[PDB]
């Protein structure tokens, strides 16, 4: 192929990656900072771990209606 030390010492590599790598870093930063991570993965924000109805940890306690119950127990 072509040695890794060959590619990593070339300036074409670095003019490609000085713009690709920070773009991915900023994309991850904005994914966290916009709340899109919370929206995609369902993790609660620090203020919405408890509601005014339940003040303890949720319990799924149901299998065939688990979707409906996690909808009820989640942050609306």
């Amino acid at each position: 192929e072509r040695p890794f030390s060959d590619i990593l010492t070339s300036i074409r590599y670095w003019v490609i990656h000085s713009i690709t790598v920070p773009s991915l870093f900023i994309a991850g930063w904005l994914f966290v900072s916009t709340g899109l991570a919370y929206d995609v993965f369902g993790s609660p924000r620090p203020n919405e771990y408890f509601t005014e109805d339940r003040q303890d940890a949720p319990l799924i306690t149901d299998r065939f209606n688990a979707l409906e119950q996690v909808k009820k127990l989640s942050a609306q």
């Binding site: 030390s5 060959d6 990593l8 010492t9 070339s10 300036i11 670095w14 620090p46």
Partner: protein, 36 residues
């Protein structure tokens, strides 16, 4: 082929890695998961 020295590349990469590790260690004492 060879323009920037590989040792300089590795030094910059290691500096960035050490900086990220230092940022992660700083984040253990601030914000979420910091006991405060």
């Amino acid at each position: 082929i060879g323009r920037i020295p590989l040792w300089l590349v590795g030094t910059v990469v290691g500096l960035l890695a050490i900086g990220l590790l230092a940022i992660f260690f700083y984040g253990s004492y601030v914000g979420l998961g910091s006991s405060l």
